[PDB]
Design goal:
heterodimer; A: Serine Threonine Protein Phosphatase 5, Tetratricopeptide repeat; B: 327 residues; binds calcium ion; binds zinc ion; transferase; protein prenylation; Metal-binding; Prenyltransferase
Chain lengths: 313, 327
């Protein structure tokens, strides 16, 4: 009853797409680079944005028409194309072809309104904060418009605190921070502020991995243990105690256990050897799928310890 | 934490006969006009079917002569190869075509000199590669370029140091790689970039312990692997992640038995084929990546597979293209 109508309509759609595709290839072979091609491809690309040859056909048409149309006619075509693209992105926001066509179009305009494109990105990131295509496009727009890293840094903070799904936003921060502090390895005052920010994040949502991955990076981005300032030493010891408190709240949370180990390494590997081994045992019991990783990590750390003990005068 | 739940009745045995039957009959089951919507990737579709059949020892059941004629018809005057007749050339389908011709030891079916010129023409000043003349830059295309050229014995045709510099500029805080500089790490681009670095003899530049950790954390309680944090696991991501781990010498960092069980659960017991996830509709793409994953996990009934080229190792031995891996 209800399934045959669905089978038949989808058969009709396929016949239309095939006919329209046939028409486009025939027009192309005939050298007919005109608006009828734009009409035909619009019927196909909405549902099938990965049909790359059809995006190429649209570009050939737009290039041809630019040569023969008034500047005002050409501007009208560009605006129609921007609207078509946005309607396509709303249906399928994860198509490489659609985002590339938008990049191609914007890159050739006199002309372009980049602030409006940044807003298009903000809108799509509100819908899906993990859409890498949209983040990549945002990076493109920001480079084209010469948006300052500090501005982009303020954007990431708002996205990290307003809700979760933060891996993409933490990633962006990891790229922006070294720009605000560019060396030919973050400065400690910067690092300490980041540690504060990320620690807020993993105490708010201890289950999400993004803050824990970012934190591990931060723990390597600094001075070195033999170089710890009293402030940094004190901050890392405070973090160690806070992770132990989280361990009590969430006994199945493997991220906090791993981080306890990494903090002890950052503070004093030999002094904390006993506790490090104890934590590896607990952690392997809590996260058994990672047991081989954890054994290799422990082996690495024990070899580091041997080398440290052999340095002994 | 987002994960699939495998049901107690999921397949738990390898159904190789059904998979070979499935692929041998693929594209004969519906009317011609129905299949249609995937013509834009046909050359890669052909590669998936042929490669999985060869891994299963059943390549002869496919139509060699028909496919060679098809490939010849898909090479354009610029040297590049398209997905299908009348479609436009692209590095993706140029790779797929050269992979197929390598399987069949029929490389001179196409004009090799012109393929090399096409690939060479797509390299940019920064060492990156565009996919075609329209200029989309992606590390996927760096891999397509060097993999195509390695198979042809012509890696020296491109600017290799600049290509390497570009790929390394895409390395991230977490040890992974994205599309372009500044792009977030993704299993697909990690696979392309680690494959690229294997081909160019640059795996010493990877932080294998850091990247290995990011990769082994893709394994969910179901046993399946996802392609980045907070995604559902699937057979495609599972191959990309497992192959990357193999390239960097850390395959043992995932639970191999749990992954095997996940991949087997994606088989369709009635039709053959694998789907992206348990219960879903099968396709040749996931059939290849499921069989390939099982092979890397040690399945004796399947030929050893290259984690770099996703082709039988015995084929790559024949052309003497076997990049050293980390271990
Ligand atoms: Ca045959
Ligand atoms: Ca599916
Ligand atoms: Zn998939």
């Amino acid at each position: 009853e209800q399934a045959e109508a669905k089978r038949l309509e989808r058969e009709q759609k396929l016949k239309l797409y095939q006919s329209a595709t046939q028409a486009v290839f025939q027009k192309r072979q005939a050298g007919e680079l005109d608006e009828s091609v734009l009409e035909l491809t619009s019927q196909i690309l909405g549902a099938n944005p990965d049909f790359a040859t059809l995006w190429n056909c649209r570009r050939e048409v737009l290039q041809h028409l630019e040569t023969e149309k008034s500047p005002e006619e050409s501007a009208a075509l560009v605006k129609a194309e921007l609207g078509f693209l946005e309607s396509c992105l709303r249906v399928n926001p994860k198509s490489y072809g659609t985002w590339h066509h938008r990049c191609w179009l914007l890159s050739r305009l006199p002309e372009p309104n980049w602030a409006r494109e940044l807003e298009l990105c903000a809108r799509f990131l509100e819908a899906d904060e993990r859409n890498f295509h949209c983040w990549d496009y945002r990076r493109f727009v920001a480079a084209q418009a010469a948006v300052a890293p500090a501005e982009e840094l303020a954007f990431t903070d708002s996205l990290i605190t307003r809700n979760f799904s933060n891996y993409s936003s933490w990633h962006y921060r990891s790229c922006l921070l070294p720009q605000l502090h560019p060396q030919p390895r973050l400065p400690e005052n910067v690092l300490l502020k980041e540690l504060e920010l990320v620690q807020n994040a993993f105490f708010t949502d201890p289950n999400d991995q993004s803050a824990w991955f970012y934190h591990r990076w931060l723990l390597g981005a600094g001075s070195g243990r033999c170089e710890l300032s009293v402030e940094k030493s004190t901050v890392l010891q405070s973090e160690l105690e806070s992770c132990k408190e989280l361990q009590e709240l969430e006994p199945e949370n493997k991220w906090c256990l791993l981080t306890i180990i990494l903090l002890m390494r950052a503070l004093d590997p030999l002094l904390y050897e006993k506790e490090t081994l104890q934590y590896f045992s607990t952690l392997k019991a809590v996260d058994p799928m990672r047991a081989a990783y954890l054994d290799d990590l422990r082996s690495k750390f024990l070899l580091e310890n041997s080398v440290l003990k052999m340095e002994y005068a | 934490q987002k994960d699939v739940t495998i049901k107690s009745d999921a397949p738990d045995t390898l159904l190789l006969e059904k998979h070979a039957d499935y692929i041998a009959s693929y594209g004969s089951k519906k009317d011609d006009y129905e299949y249609c919507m995937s013509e834009y990737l046909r050359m890669s579709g052909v590669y998936w079917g042929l490669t999985v059949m060869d891994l299963m020892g059943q390549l002869h059941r496919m139509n060699k002569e028909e496919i060679l004629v098809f490939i010849k018809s898909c090479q354009h005057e610029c040297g590049g190869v398209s997905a299908s007749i009348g479609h436009d050339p692209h590095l993706l389908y140029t790779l797929s075509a050269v992979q197929i011709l390598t399987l069949y030891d029929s490389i001179h079916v196409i004009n090799v000199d012109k393929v090399v010129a096409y690939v060479q023409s797509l390299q940019k000043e920064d060492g990156s590669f565009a996919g075609d003349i329209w200029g989309e830059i992606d590390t996927r295309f760096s891999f397509c370029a060097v993999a195509t050229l390695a198979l042809l014995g012509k890696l020296d045709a491109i600017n290799v140091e600049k290509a390497i510099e570009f790929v390394l500029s895409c390395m991230n805080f977490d040890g992974g790689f994205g599309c372009r500089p500044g792009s977030e790490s993704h299993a697909g681009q990690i696979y392309c970039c680690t494959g690229f670095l294997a081909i160019t003899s640059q795996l010493h530049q990877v932080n294998s312990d850091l990247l290995g950790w990011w990769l082994c954390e893709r394994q969910l309680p179901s046993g399946g692997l996802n392609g980045r944090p907070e995604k559902l696991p699937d057979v495609c991501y599972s191959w990309w992640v497992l192959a990357s781990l193999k390239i960097i010498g850390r395959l043992h960092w995932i639970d191999r038995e749990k992954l095997r069980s996940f991949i087997l659960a994606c088989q369709d017991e009635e039709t053959g084929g694998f789907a992206d996830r348990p219960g879903d509709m099968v396709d040749p793409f996931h059939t290849l990546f499921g069989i390939a994953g099982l092979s890397l996990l040690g399945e004796e009934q399947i030929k050893p597979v290259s984690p770099v080229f996703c082709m039988p190792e015995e084929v790559l031995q024949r052309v003497n293209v076997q990049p050293e891996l980390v271990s």
